[PDB]
Amino acid sequence: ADLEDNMETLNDNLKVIEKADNAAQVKDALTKMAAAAADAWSATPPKLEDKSPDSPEMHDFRHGFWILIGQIHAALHLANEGKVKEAQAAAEQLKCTCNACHQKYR
Amino acid sequence: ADLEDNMETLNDNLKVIEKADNAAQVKDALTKMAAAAADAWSATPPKLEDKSPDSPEMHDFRHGFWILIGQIHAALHLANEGKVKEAQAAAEQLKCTCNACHQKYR
Amino acid sequence: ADLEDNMETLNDNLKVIEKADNAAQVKDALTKMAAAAADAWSATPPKLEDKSPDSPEMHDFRHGFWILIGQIHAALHLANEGKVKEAQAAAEQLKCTCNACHQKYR
Amino acid sequence: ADLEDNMETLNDNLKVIEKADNAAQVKDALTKMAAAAADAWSATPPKLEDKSPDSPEMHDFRHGFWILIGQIHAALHLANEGKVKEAQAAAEQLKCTCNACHQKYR
Ligand code: HEC
Ligand code: HEC
Ligand code: HEC
Ligand code: HEC
């Protein structure tokens, strides 16, 4: 799927996590977030569409999703352990990473 | 694309890197390797097909790719700084990660 | 060093970076920030001193440093490729991560 | 707190994990490993004393500990979930990251 589908999957699961009640909610939402970020790896954003795929901006772009997935999986670890409040806090902290990349390349 | 084709992308680009002469060849191959690993995120391997998608086994399958990509990117940073023998050495050490997953899920 | 000393080091190098002129300056400041974060790994912040050192808050405390270092190394790459404004922007965006840990445990 | 010592706590705790019976042994040992890896961040290994403190090699050295600690925490969450075999296997697959750094810099 293209970047646009995947981003809007990222945003919706962040909200599912916020108005979540039980851990299963959060686990599934976090799992789907990790896949959407992984799926967005191949995409080239429009402002980088004239860059070559091994440029410093393009590399930082992909690296950003790699950091996001590491952060998603850590929150997924809190969800697996039944820590619903913590995973939700961890899910809200993800938008340092969402905003960082939007600022630079969106 | 196909998990198989993704593995072939990793294996063949490992071959390019070993034979390469300049940093740009290795930089490019490493970048194609990270892409192939990200794409394989969505795959279910044949020996894990009758496990739950949220099983500890399918989660570990993905964690393996996250570690791989991190190591690929670590090898790219050396290539970026033009240390080609060092990047090629670092690319060789990746087969410990390829193999670690293979024992488990191939 | 001190948790305080490590914070002030983190604080001072953000200012060095904004006021930098060349990539070597940003690179150097970023490298020290990462060292101060790793060094803080062992600290117990005053608001968590009566918590188990293996509690999810103390694990989350260290994890925050692990995320910060990842973000520092990502901005270091842009500086390594000599893109000083891009690195300066990325450095400033680390503050979102500083703030996140402060709201929880400062 | 010296590199030699930090390596030695990493090696002994990986053996403790290898011989553990209950999760509490694994959790305690993994926790000590993550701490030793962070403590070694500042070291210059003997084979890199003729490089810039910010050479691509010295950065790649520090980066290895950052990837290691991530792997350590991922196995720790398995132990937290009382999955001792999975934690033990995760701890064993850690060798790739130990060996990779040894091959390059020991
Ligand atoms: C972290 C959790 C998030 C969340 C919730 C979102 N993103 Fe991103 N994003 C990136 C880029 C380059 C774009 C532009 C895409 C385009 O212009 O075609 C976006 C876009 C979005 C949107 C708007 C989607 C739309 O329908 O147009 C939304 C809602 C969104 N994002 C949410 C790039 C990145 C990243 C690059 C490394 C990362 C990380 C994120 N975004 C993270 C997130
Ligand atoms: C690391 C750099 C590598 C390299 C060079 C290769 N792989 Fe993998 N791989 C995984 C699984 C489950 C399979 C089985 C696929 C199936 O049977 O459907 C494979 C397979 C391969 C092949 C064989 C291709 C063929 O058609 O026979 C090759 C050449 C290959 N790989 C190269 C799973 C993983 C991982 C999980 C986390 C990781 C990491 C890797 N593989 C890494 C690598
Ligand atoms: C993972 C946790 C964490 C992160 C990340 C973090 N901090 Fe802090 N920092 C703290 C805590 C907790 C305190 C309060 C300690 C105290 O009061 O003794 C603190 C204190 C401080 C202080 C004030 C020190 C004092 O005593 O006056 C400054 C300035 C500061 N941090 C800056 C930063 C900057 C800049 C960053 C990021 C670049 C950062 N911190 C990242 C946890 C964190
Ligand atoms: C990022 C780099 C890095 C990582 C990761 C790393 N090492 Fe090391 N290790 C070194 C270096 C460099 C030395 C050499 C120190 C010296 O010569 O004084 C060393 C030395 C050692 C030694 C002392 C043995 C001897 O004969 O000198 C042991 C034991 C050891 N490492 C075990 C481990 C284990 C176990 C792991 C992971 C679980 C690990 N190392 C991961 C860099 C690393």
SS (H, E, C) chain B: CCHHHHHHHHHHHHHHHHHCCCHHHHHHHHHHHHHHHHHHHHCCCHHHCCCCCCCHHHHHHHHHHHHHHHHHHHHHHHHHCCCHHHHHHHHHHCHHHHHHHHHHHC
Whether chain B has a CB inside 8 Å of the CB on A47: the answer is no
Amino acid at A103: Q
Whether chain D has a CB inside 8 Å of the CB on C28: the answer is yes
SS (H, E, C) C45-58: CHHHCCCCCCCHHH
Count CB-CB contacts under 10 A for residue B35: 20
Cβ atoms C89, A103 nearer than 8 A: yes
User: Is residue A102 annotated as involved in ligand binding?
Assistant: yes
Cβ atoms C26, C79 nearer than 8 A: yes
Amino acid at A50: D
Mutate: best of B51, B93, B94, partner D, most D CBs <10 A? B93
Shortest Cα–Cα distance, A103 to chain B (Å): 23
CA–CA dist A36, B42 (Å, integer): 9
Q: What is the DSSP string of A24-80?
A: HHHHHHHHHHHHHHHHGGG---GGGTTS-TTSHHHHHHHHHHHHHHHHHHHHHHHHH
User: Nearest Cβ partner of B66 from A31, A62, A70?
Assistant: A70
CA–CA dist A9, A91 (Å, integer): 14
Q: Could you tell me the residue ranges of all domains in chain B? A: 1-106
**Beta carbons within 8 Å of A83's beta carbon, 6+ residues apart:** A23, C56
The CB-based long-range contact list for C41-45 (8 Å cut-off, 24+ gap) reads C41/C65, C41/D34, C41/D35, C41/D38, C41/D39, C42/D35, C42/D38, C42/D39, C43/C3, C43/C6, C45/C3, C45/C105, C45/C106
CA–CA dist D64, D45 (Å, integer): 13
Rounded (10°) CA dihedral C9, C53, C73, B36:
-170
SS3 content of chain D, % helix, strand, coil (to 5): 80, 0, 20
Backbone angles phi, psi at C19, to 5 degrees: -85, 10
Which of A102, A78, A89, A82 has the alpha carbon at shortest distance from A17? A89
Token code pair at residue D21: 């019976």
Count CB-CB contacts under 10 A for residue C86: 19
Residues in C closer than 8 angstroms to A90, CB to CB, are 60
CA C33 distance to own-chain centroid = 5
Which of C73, C70, C46 has the alpha carbon at shortest distance from C58? C46
Token code pair at residue B51: 């496990």
Instruction: Identify the experimental approach.
Output: X-ray
- Using the beta-carbon criterion (under 8 Å), do D73 and C63 form an inter-chain contact? yes
**Beta carbons within 8 Å of C9's beta carbon, 6+ residues apart:** C1, C32, C33, C36
Cβ atoms A104, C77 nearer than 8 A: no
What residue in B sits closest to C81 (Cα-Cα)? B80
> Helix H segments across chain C?
3-18, 23-39, 56-80, 84-93, 95-105
Least distant ligand from the CA of C60: 3
Tell me whether residue C53 is exposed, middle or buried, using C-beta atoms within 10 angstroms of its C-beta: 0 to 12, 13 to 18, 19 or more. Answer: middle
CA–CA dist B106, A29 (Å, integer): 28
Cβ atoms C90, A57 nearer than 8 A: no
Q: To which residue do tokens 């070993």 refer?
A: B18
Which of D37, D39, D102, D106 has the alpha carbon at shortest distance from D71? D37
CA A54 distance to own-chain centroid = 22
Resolution of the solved structure (Å):
2.2
Token code pair at residue D16: 């403790």
Token code pair at residue A26: 């959060």
**Beta carbons within 8 Å of C26's beta carbon, 6+ residues apart:** C17, C20, C75, C79, C84, C87, C88, C91
